[PDB]
Amino acid sequence: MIIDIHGHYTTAPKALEDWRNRQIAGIKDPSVMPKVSELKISDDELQASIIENQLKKMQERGSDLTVFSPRASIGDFNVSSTWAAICNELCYRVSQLFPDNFIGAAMLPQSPGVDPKTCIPELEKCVKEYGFVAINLNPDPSTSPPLTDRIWYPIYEKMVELEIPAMIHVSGAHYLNADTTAFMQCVAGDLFKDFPELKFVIPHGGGAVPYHWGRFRGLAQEMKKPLLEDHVLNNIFFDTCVYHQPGIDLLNTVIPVDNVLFASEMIGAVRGIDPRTGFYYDDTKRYIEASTILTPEEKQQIYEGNARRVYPRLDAALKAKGKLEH
C-alpha cells in the first residue's frame, strides 16, 4: 500500500474558519468570543469536503492512506488549547468516516514561552481516544529554545512512552528554514543519547539538508561527533515533499532509503501544474515511480515499510484492521 505521512485538512467546511475568525476577533473584543458548542459541522458536510477533494485526488494518484493533521496557519494558551481541541476532533471525525484512508496526527496547543507540558493533555487524548499515530511539533511557535533544550524533554518522554514520532512543523518558505535549523540543532547536540527511541520527521525533504549534506558531514566531523549515520540517522527521517525530479534524485542519492518516508502534502502550498512535466508539482509519487536510482523494493520501503517502523501506532492500527476484516 501507499502511505502519505504529510497532509493537512485544508478543505474543511467554512464554518471552521468562521469560528476561528470569531475567536481571533474575541481576543481583542471578548464581547464577540464564540462558544465551542456554537461550531456545528455535520457528517454530510465532512464527507463532501473529503470525497470531492483529498479522497478524489488520492484515488487518481494511487495513494491509499494519509496521516491527516490540522492545517498550520496570537492568543494565549486558552485560545490555543480550545482551537487545537476543535481541529483535532475534526480530523478524528474524518478518520471515522473514512477509516481506510485517513488516520490522524495531532496539532498541539503550543503558545510562545509556555511550558510544553501544557500540551500533554491534548497529546494523550489524541493518541488514546482518537487513535492518532503522531504529533506535529512546532519548534518555533512565535526566540524559541532549540530542540536539544530540556524544556522539550517532557514531550519527548511522552513520545517515547506512547511510541509516536513528531513531525517538526512550523506554522512564503519559512518552513524550509525551520527544517534546516531543526536538523542543525540535533547535529550540534546529543539529544538521541538521552532519548535513543525518539523519532523526528523533518518535512520538505529535510529543508536544505540533503543539498548541503557534505557541509553537515563536515560539521559533525569538526564537532567531534559520530558519523551522521549513527549520530542522527537512527532518529531523524525526511519526507518526500520535494516537488521536482532533480530534487527527489538528490534526496535518494545522499540520504539512505531507510530515512525517506513518502509524502506529498497535497492541496496545500503548491497546487499548480508544472507546464514542463504536464502534471501537478505535488504529485510526488510520480517522482518515486520515475526514479531509476531506487529499486522496486526500496520504493515500497519509502511508500510503506519505513512509515510502519517510524510510526509503531500506525503499524499496530494496520495489523488490527486486516485482522478484523479477516
Residues contributing to the annotated binding site: 6, 8, 169, 265
Give phi and psi for 287, each to the nearest 5: -70, -35
Q: Is 109 in the site for a copy of itself (CB under 8 A)?
A: no
Report in angstroms how near the CB of residue 178 gets to a copy of itself at its nearest: 8
Q: Is 250 in the site for a copy of itself (CB under 8 A)?
A: yes
Q: Is 30 in the site for a copy of itself (CB under 8 A)?
A: no
- What separation in angstroms does the CA of 97 have from each of 13, 50, 183, 237? 15, 10, 36, 30
Q: Is 172 in the site for a copy of itself (CB under 8 A)?
A: yes
Comparison of 272 and 322: residue with beta carbon closer to a copy of itself? 272
- 265 classed as catalytic: yes
**Grid coordinates standing for 216?**
553537515
Q: Is 272 in the site for a copy of itself (CB under 8 A)?
A: yes
| Cβ count within 10 A of residue 78 | 11
- Under a CB-based contact definition with an 8 Å cutoff, are residues 167 and 136 in contact? yes
Report in angstroms how near the CB of residue 209 gets to a copy of itself at its nearest: 8
Residue span binding a copy of itself (CB under 8 A) among the ranges 47-55, 95-103, 124-132, 171-179: 171-179
Q: Return d(Cα 34, Cα 64) in angstroms, integer.
A: 37
E strands, the chain, in order: 3-8, 65-69, 102-104, 106-107, 135-137, 166-168, 200-202, 236-239, 260-261
Comparison of 244 and 308: residue with beta carbon closer to a copy of itself? 244
Which of the residues 265, 297, 298, 325 is marked catalytic? 265
- What separation in angstroms does the CA of 180 have from each of 131, 167, 188? 30, 13, 12
Q: Is 218 in the site for a copy of itself (CB under 8 A)?
A: yes
* Active-site residue set: 265
**Interaction site with a copy of itself (CB under 8 A):** 143, 172-174, 176-177, 180-181, 184-185, 187-188, 204-205, 207-208, 210-219, 221-222, 242-244, 246-247, 249-250, 253-254, 269-272, 274, 281-282
